[PDB]
């Protein structure tokens, strides 16, 4: 069923984050893993899979550790040919050339589209729709992560969603609607002067998927 919408004072306030917002920003500013039709080559711990994926652009990784919520998810995708799409990290990437991410995995077979599919993001500032823009995927089932990355990546460029020290926006959540059912993620870091990249991205480790045909995306921001 539907996840309920944010209650009063449920959302992280960016004014209560006193650290460097840079460390959030760099997760959505040109920082992503992407690969087509690959199969795991190894495994470190029981809830992860390792893929041979080369950073052709910047050469920052040859292997990617994809971390799941549980063993079942890893077992499921172990020997499957998959597509990978997600926001990765290096700082405190535990992997005994390398990088870490969570989820972002979909079966390749039976999930490709003849042509790219568009999903319109409706962006609200203090309730008002001032901006709309499409994200595209080639997948019938696509991870919320992939969509989330694409949305925030856009918004980091244009609207400066995140900056080195702090955001123009006090609160922000991204909402995914499929028919009646919906869910959302808080786009702002927990309060304090310590931002843990790995901890934040761990929300993607459920590998949550949506139908790219039915899903609508709404971004609700508030100003200062």
């Amino acid at each position, epitope marked *: 069923e539907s996840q309920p919408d944010p209650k009063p004072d449920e959302l992280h306030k960016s004014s209560k984050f006193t650290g*460097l917002m*840079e*460390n959030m*920003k*760099v997760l959505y*500013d040109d*920082n992503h893993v992407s690969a087509i039709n690959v199969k795991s080559i190894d495994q470190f711990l029981y809830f992860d899979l390792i893929y041979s994926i080369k950073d052709t*652009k*910047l*050469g*920052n990784y040859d292997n990617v550790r994809v971390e799941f919520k549980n063993k079942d998810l890893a077992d499921k995708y172990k020997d499957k040919y998959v597509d990978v799409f997600g926001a990765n990290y*290096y*700082y405190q990437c535990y992997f005994s050339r390398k990088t870490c991410m969570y989820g972002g995995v979909t079966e390749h077979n039976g999930n490709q589209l003849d042509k790219y599919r568009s999903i319109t993001v409706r962006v609200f500032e203090d309730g008002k729709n001032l901006l709309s823009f499409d994200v595209q995927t080639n997948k019938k089932k696509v991870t919320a992560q992939e969509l989330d990355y694409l949305t925030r990546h856009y918004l980091v460029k244009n609207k400066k969603l995140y900056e*080195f020290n702090n955001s123009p926006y006090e609160t922000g959540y991204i909402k995914f609607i499929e028919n009646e059912n919906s869910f959302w993620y808080d786009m702002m870091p927990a309060p304090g002067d*310590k931002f843990d*990249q790995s901890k934040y991205l761990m929300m993607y480790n459920d590998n949550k998927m949506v139908d790219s045909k039915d899903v609508k995306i709404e971004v609700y921001l508030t100003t200062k």
Partner: nanobody
Amino acid sequence: QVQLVESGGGSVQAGGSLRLSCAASGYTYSMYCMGWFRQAPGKEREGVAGICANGKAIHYVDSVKGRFTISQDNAKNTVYLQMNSLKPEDTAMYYCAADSRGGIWYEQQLSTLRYNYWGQGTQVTVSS
């Protein structure tokens, strides 16, 4: 392929000054981090100064605070190290390093881990 070529190393005397320079080339994209490391014979390689995110994040090792200044010209794609009040302790091979990975890695920001690209270095000498 990335290339870092350091220069400006020399043989000075206690209380002297040197300005290191590094010419970066071969990528055509924007580098996130650029830094200066040093290593003497015997001792492990140590990070000295760093400058990240269009100069928004500058860090120094304690032993060079107030004496060394890292700086950047984006127009030239050069990084500099103004080395004032030099001491025998500062004698070493100085290396420029670079990195395209983002973030300010608390306490690991001047470690060798933070950087993937490296020059061949320039010798610095300081005589009592």
